[PDB]
Symmetry: C3
């Protein structure tokens, strides 16, 4: 899984950034069973004032988490994962849930490469 994580610059110290990546990665490993190192967390920082809720410019306190996932998981499991992510990030990032957005997109594992290797192959 890859998690693009969109955040403002000077908002997450280079530490709660570790706390958050570990939050995401540990929820994922523990709900899905995917081995730790298969879980990538990629932070996309942008200057504050680059997010707009309703066409209103916001401060720097928004976290969007966009997970790119393989198919096969269930509404239920993915619901547990999104909630667990909102929460652990809430703490790790010492930010409140209402600032966290979480979107999962799914993809056939045939079209996902990790470590240069395919997850599922035509074979």
């Amino acid at each position: 899984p890859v998690y693009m994580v969109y955040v403002s610059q000077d908002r997450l110290t280079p530490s709660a950034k570790h706390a958050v990546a570990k939050a995401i990665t540990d929820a994922h490993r523990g709900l899905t069973g995917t081995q730790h190192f298969l879980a990538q967390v990629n932070f996309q920082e942008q200057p504050a004032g680059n997010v707009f809720l309703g066409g209103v410019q916001q401060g720097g306190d928004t976290i969007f988490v966009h997970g790119l996932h393989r198919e096969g998981r269930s509404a239920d499991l993915k619901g547990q994962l999104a909630q667990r992510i909102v929460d652990d990030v809430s703490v790790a990032a010492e930010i409140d849930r209402k600032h966290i957005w979480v979107y999962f997109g799914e993809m056939p594992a045939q079209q996902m490469v990790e470590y240069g290797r395919f997850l599922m192959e035509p074979g």
Copy 2:
């Protein structure tokens, strides 16, 4: 809905950036009926010369708009929305349509969190 909006740095002033977010958000609210504040617009700026059309490096005058949407809308409505977005951004950004690209991706609303809350839940 979340709209990642990819643009070069020093191209959109911190103003036409408001004009564009409002463009996107108002087209969306008015074609789909989603309440204003549920519409997030997230700007991803990169230095100019970071986009390549055909493996040719371009200036800073490209806008890519990547919408992350829930399912259920129609080809028709989404076509109207993409066109309306190309246009209003064309003006707001005082940029021409040929520079704007618009891609919608869809996702079950069960796997979309806004304001820490799920849109549709297992329930």
Copy 3:
């Protein structure tokens, strides 16, 4: 097709960046037959230490390639494309395959705008 390409800053010179965009774009044109200029490559640079494999912070030597594609291609063709991309980038970027991740997402061409024009239209 659009290829978001996520990379650390001061890792790809403004040259192997051309080499990589051309790598991606030429694999795509030659496996799929899409005309050169329809192939966008968009580089998203972030400071090093912004990627986490397993909740472990990595250097600046990770390339994630996220392709946004129209539907209709096959597991087979897309597998060839992901592999060809991992490889040509491996060389162009003088980086090893284990650092490259490749994820394709698919979208009805009705909801993809290139150059302000729709790929397929309701019509």
